[PDB]
Design a protein around this ligand. Structure first.
Ligand code: PJD
Ligand code: PJD
Lengths: 325, 325
């Protein structure tokens, strides 16, 4: 029912955007079918973890607070695809980072995917009293993500910023705000119960779950094989400010740090294996278990504090944390 | 006074955006000075033709309709920089079209410049009753520009689309909407006199002035030397759907079209000179004078129709047309 409704609204959103281009933007059918194939390629295929979270938060606030039910659920599906389209926009920009027409189309695809989030919001929420507040919070979170990408890209240019506090700043702005906090806020806006929750505890939970999610991703990028991870890990070659790097530099000797700096950020297969050897000898995978356990305790405690004022809203956060844990 | 006030508001807009990153986004001073230098590089240096147009439209509607004067003029300066920041966003995306950190920073700069238009609007217009209507029209024009870039990039991929009607469609969506129509609408919104004008005649004037502006740019790209144009013309090498191409294909013989197709879209210095020779022998620079004269007559006539219901608003359009002519 949730996934089936989320994909049914996708056909409604896609049909409007493509017909709007045909009727109001004078687009030929050849480009309409081109943009339909591009939209399905970039937006469909994922697990829809961000989009379905908006649905799970909305369905809890309407039953635990009937023409209003069908509207709130449909509004959450549109907001769910706004984030999925936004995620597709970020992924397209990442492919460009790593008269050529394929690059011109990639840049154009990234602009259309972002603008489509505004077009589907200005239409399905044209008469909603929260249209102005939704666009402002959506644009501020998108601006937050762009700032987080500046922290991540320039994390090794200005190992001084290879600290645990700066790592949290990267995860917070680059990932946690739009992946965990944005779906929760959008579920509150479509349910008209936004000021009825403690945003401080809600924001604190979103940053902890994103931190828990990024630490697990950093370890799998280095140790999980490519066929079992789904991609090729490249954090060591790209000199990323990963959780393994900032934790190794804290418990390593002067020679181990010198050997780390002489091998980190290189594409050599032996230098990357040297960095993995330093991570293995430092027992970082043992500290990874203890670090994630402490974060999980902080999540289980803040949900109860959020439950004292948001009983149903905390039930969706546990489900959100359940799929992260 | 106009230019001096427009640059004074720039310092106010820049100071807010940078302090917001320092106070609300936890940005270190090294990156704040980095973003200050990037903002001045991408946004400053141009002629500010789009930004100053918003000021000229606003000052006419307040004197030809005193604490309201200072607010409307300041609101027009913020809207003027929203377009200038938007133009800088488009230019940065064009540089990308033609672990590399310089490309990651270029993509990040393009995202920040676009988001800065929303941040400066959500702040200086936070209590304005037109904040929701301004963002929707701004996002729709930005979406219009992205669609126009799809028409321009794919103008030779799908010489069938090398027609005068499709050329007008490219100029309309790619350039005319955000360069000529957007500054006029923003001048009406800050003056609270938007529904007091004929938008049909206003839109028709914006597309004609943009068409008049693009035809002149296409001829200068081919004939004006690099030192006198400010850049190197490359429409022939890039196989662009220029006004010279769509006009040549209409008045050329079968061999001249065959010679055109065998030389258009190539970087060879002799093939580009062959295309220029075909343009010279077809007397296209003679038709360019007659085509621009007919467009100028249509502009001078629609301003009078717009004057019958918008006396002062048409005075700024003549000034807008005066700098285009
Ligand atoms: C979108 S994500 O990166 O997969 C994080 C996530 C997960 Cl893992 C499970 C449910 C919701 C979310 Cl937001
Ligand atoms: C921004 S532009 O491309 O220079 C077109 C223009 C001109 Cl030429 C003169 C005044 C206003 C405008 Cl919008």
């Amino acid at each position: 029912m949730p996934m089936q409704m989320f994909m049914q609204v996708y056909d409604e959103i896609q049909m409007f955007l493509l017909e709007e281009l045909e009727l109001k933007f004078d687009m030929d059918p050849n480009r309409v079918r081109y943009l339909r194939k591009m939209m399905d390629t970039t937006c469909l295929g994922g697990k829809y973890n961000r989009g379905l979270t908006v649905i799970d938060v909305a369905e809890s606030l309407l039953s635990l607070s009937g023409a209003r039910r069908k509207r709130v659920l449909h509004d959450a599906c549109v907001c769910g695809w706004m984030i999925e389209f936004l995620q597709a926009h970020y992924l397209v920009e990442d492919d460009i980072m790593d008269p050529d027409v394929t690059v011109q189309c990639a840049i154009n695809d990234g602009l259309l995917l972002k603008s489509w989030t505004h077009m589907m919001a200005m239409h399905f929420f044209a008469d909603r009293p929260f249209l102005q507040d939704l666009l402002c919070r959506f644009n501020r979170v998108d601006y937050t993500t762009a700032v987080g990408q500046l922290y991540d890209v320039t994390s090794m240019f200005d190992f001084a910023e290879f600290t645990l506090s700066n790592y949290k700043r990267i995860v917070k702005y680059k990932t946690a705000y739009y992946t965990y906090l944005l779906p929760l806020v959008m579920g509150l806006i479509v349910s008209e119960a936004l000021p009825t929750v403690d945003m401080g505890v809600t924001e604190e939970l979103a940053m902890l779950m994103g931190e828990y999610f990024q630490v697990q991703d950093d370890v799998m990028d280095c140790f999980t094989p490519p066929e079992r991870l789904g991609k090729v890990g490249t954090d060591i070659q790209d000199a990323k400010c990963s959780w393994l790097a900032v934790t190794f530099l804290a418990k390593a000797s002067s020679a181990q740090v010198a050997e780390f700096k002489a091998n980190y950020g290189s594409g050599d297969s032996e230098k990357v294996a040297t960095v993995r050897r330093l991570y293995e000898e430092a027992d970082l995978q043992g500290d990874y278990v203890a670090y994630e356990a402490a974060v999980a305790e902080q999540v289980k405690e803040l949900i109860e504090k959020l439950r004292l004022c948001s009983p149903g809203f905390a039930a969706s956060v546990e489900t959100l944390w359940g799929k992260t844990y």
